[PDB]
Amino acid sequence: AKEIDVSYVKIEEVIGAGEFGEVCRGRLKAPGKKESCVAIKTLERQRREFLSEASIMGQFEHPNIIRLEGVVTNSMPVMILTEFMENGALDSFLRLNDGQFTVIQLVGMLRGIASGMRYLAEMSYVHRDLAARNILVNSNLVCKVSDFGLSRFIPIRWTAPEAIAFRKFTSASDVWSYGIVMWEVMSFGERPYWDMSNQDVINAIEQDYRLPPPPDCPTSLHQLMLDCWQKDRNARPRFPQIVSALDKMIRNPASLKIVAR
Ligand SMILES: Cc1ccc(C(=O)Nc2cccc(C(F)(F)F)c2)cc1Nc1nc(-c2cccnc2)nc2c1cnn2C
Numbered sequence: 001a002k003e004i005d006v007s008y009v010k011i012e013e014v015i016g017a018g019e020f021g022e023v024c025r026g027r028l029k030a031p032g033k034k035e036s037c038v039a040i041k042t043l044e045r046q047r048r049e050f051l052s053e054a055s056i057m058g059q060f061e062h063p064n065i066i067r068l069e070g071v072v073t074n075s076m077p078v079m080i081l082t083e084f085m086e087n088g089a090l091d092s093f094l095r096l097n098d099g100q101f102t103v104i105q106l107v108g109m110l111r112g113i114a115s116g117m118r119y120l121a122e123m124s125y126v127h128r129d130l131a132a133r134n135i136l137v138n139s140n141l142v143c144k145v146s147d148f149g150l151s152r153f154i155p156i157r158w159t160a161p162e163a164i165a166f167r168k169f170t171s172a173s174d175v176w177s178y179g180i181v182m183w184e185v186m187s188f189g190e191r192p193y194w195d196m197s198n199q200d201v202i203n204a205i206e207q208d209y210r211l212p213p214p215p216d217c218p219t220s221l222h223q224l225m226l227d228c229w230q231k232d233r234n235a236r237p238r239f240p241q242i243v244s245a246l247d248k249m250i251r252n253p254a255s256l257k258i259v260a261r
Helices: 049-057 090-096 103-122 161-165 171-186 198-206 219-228 239-251 253-257
Strands: 009-018 021-029 035-041 068-072 079-083 135-137 143-145
Touching (some): 009 035, 049 079, 103 239, 103 253, 161 198, 171 219, 219 239, 219 253, 239 253
Antiparallel strands (some): 009 021, 021 035, 035 079, 068 079
């Protein structure tokens, strides 16, 4: 929770809205450091809920987790600052780039997301809302796991079946969500389960249906999705094994040439 002096922070265009107010694009100019772009949540009662998020974010330091720049608490407005990700959310970025990235590039995106989740899981942090809309993409296509919560610029179709029903959220339920993210990525941002209703999705999953391989998806990647969607949560791979599986694919790209009929 590094405190930032406001004279370094200049607020520009509004990019969306949050639970506690606006979210804006901005610039950060600190002594001795270059000027960079930042995204800023602004904020009123004495509720410390707004800043409690910053206390959570400050624990995280990883190349695939959104990086908190700092906070302003001795000023108005009160603000949470992170690095600014030029390509925005992954789902809309991929829809804008439909069919325009190679399989190897998509796998590299997924490997980054998996590494970020591996870190969170190692930290005993359960995300609970992992979805492509919660991943930000930088100019080099590095994907960073984020959590926008209640935001704008209830999601059961990313949630493991045991978390929907029993409200049992674990890293293994995040693994389920990660498999959905894999499908979103290999589908260039198609909505999981198309236009099915939330109830239809729950019923389909309970009947053991699983999203099919996206067009051109390597069979080995869809199998990895199916592994993440095992009903028995203890049978799903853990994030370390997921990273290792993707790394094996990057080393052996001939394995990614096998697609289904
Ligand atoms: C400004 C901000 C504030 C919070 C978070 C965030 O991800 N917090 C969070 C909380 C709990 C757990 C985790 C996790 F575990 F996932 F790491 C993260 C990210 C951003 N940064 C941005 N927010 C928005 C944004 C936009 C609209 C509504 N809400 C947020 N747009 C952005 C950025 C950076 N670049 N861009 C384009």
